[PDB]
Design a protein around this nucleic acid. Structure first.
Ligand SMILES: Cc1cc(Cl)cnc1N1CN([C@@H](C)c2ccccc2)C(=O)c2c(O)c(=O)ccn21
Ligand SMILES: [Mg+2]
Ligand SMILES: [Mg+2]
Ligand code: NA
Length: 348
DNA sequence: CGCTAGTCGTC
DNA sequence: ACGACTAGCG
């Protein structure tokens, strides 16, 4: 997520009901739904008892979209990016410590506090995702596991024209350049739609409404690939890009303290991390499910070299990318857990 | 005062 | 891994 982005661009948002997309295609950031579902059966998931309540949760939202004539494409996160492996292991450690804290709370009679604890102790596994995939496939619902982040895969589906809107709780999708993003959608279909075309309605953005400048602002403000410099949020990131007249973002960032009248010494690792974050939003690997090929989100541009971009996702053979996309190949172990083949029955 | 970030409650 | 909200900083 980009902290505060939704409130900063409030004027580009409008309340909608998903009926608006009747006869259209919509891609879903399914781990958001798996998460809410896993909270509803957290005591069983953390301890180790078998449960499928999270499956019923996701299918309630899938069945609501289908009732309104919407063709949903459920996208799932895949492999972790190299730069996020310490983060994903640190998350496992906090979830296991919250499981121990919850057990301790139940022993002290604090049942309500322990039940809360368990909700922050759950791991969303590929095996949980695969159960949702199977349930959705029986209903005729297409599923796709992104090679890496679902954010990039979803942005690809929308930029390519396959889907007309992205349902997600993550404002990163706006930074990736999605045209229509549906945030805060409830089980009944009510939600907040942000349209990229309406970014011009936001007086706070000024001229920071182009895809390039908007992405730069989101990165400078603090993003999932790079924390901000201290004292920098959306208002100051936007102010810097508004005041600067220069195509080169690297020169602008070095001069950041001057534009804001702040004491900012820009570290060496900040400039490099910025270029890496920018390259991740631009060139992260996604899967074209029609041609069944692993490709970068955008075609490579003049100032980059693909061999330096392992942090944006490593290439694997197209056949391996296809087994991952169908849900047949476990994202953590690389074991073949299923044999689904779309031919012998999105991928057409 | 505008803004950012630390605290706290919950999904 | 959220947001609300306010203290407290520049
Ligand atoms: C660890 C985590 C928890 C929650 Cl509530 C939300 N996001 C989480 N993570 C991980 N994740 C997926 C795998 C994922 C989403 C939901 C649950 C587990 C994994 C993401 O999609 C993701 C982002 O895109 C982002 O910008 C920041 C953080 N996360
Ligand atoms: Mg994501
Ligand atoms: Mg994200
Ligand atoms: Na920030």
């Amino acid at each position: 997520g980009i902290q505060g982005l939704l409130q900063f661009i409030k004027e580009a948002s409008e309340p909608i009901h998903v009926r608006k997309y009747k006869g259209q295609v919509v891609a879903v950031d399914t781990y958001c739904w798996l998460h809410k579902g896993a909270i509803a059966c957290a005591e069983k998931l953390a301890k180790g008892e078998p449960t499928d309540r999270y499956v019923g949760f996701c299918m309630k939202f899938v069945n609501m979209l289908l009732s309104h004539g919407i063709k949903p494409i459920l996208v799932f996160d895949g492999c972790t990016l190299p730069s996020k492996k310490e983060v994903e292991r640190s998350r496992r450690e906090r979830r296991q410590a919250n499981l121990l804290k919850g057990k301790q709370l139940l022993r002290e009679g604090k049942v309500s506090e322990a039940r809360e604890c368990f909700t922050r102790s759950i791991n969303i596994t590929h095996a949980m995702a695969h159960k949702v995939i199977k349930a959705a496939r029986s209903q005729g619902v297409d599923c796709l596991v992104a090679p890496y982040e679902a954010d990039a895969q979803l942005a690809y589906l929308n930029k390519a024209g396959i889907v007309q809107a992205i349902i997600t709780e993550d404002s990163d999708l706006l930074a990736f350049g999605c045209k229509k993003v549906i945030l805060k959608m409830d089980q009944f279909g009510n939600g907040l739609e942000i349209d990229q075309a309406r970014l011009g309605m936001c007086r706070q953005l000024g001229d920071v409404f182009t895809e390039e400048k908007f992405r730069y602002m989101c990165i400078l403000s603090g993003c999932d690939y790079l924390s901000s410099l201290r004292g920098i949020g959306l208002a100051k990131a936007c102010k810097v890009l508004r005041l600067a007249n220069n195509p080169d973002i690297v020169k602008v960032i070095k001069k950041i303290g001057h534009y804001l009248k702040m004491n900012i010494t820009v570290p060496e690792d900040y400039i490099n991390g910025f270029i890496r974050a920018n390259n991740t939003f631009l060139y992260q690997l996604v899967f074209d499910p029609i041609k069944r090929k692993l490709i970068p989100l955008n075609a490579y541009e003049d100032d980059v070299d693909p061999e330096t971009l392992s942090y944006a996702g490593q290439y694997v053979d197209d056949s391996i990318a296809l087994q991952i996309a169908l849900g047949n190949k476990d994202i953590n172990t690389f074991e073949q857990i299923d044999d689904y083949n779309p031919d012998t029955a999105l991928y057409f």
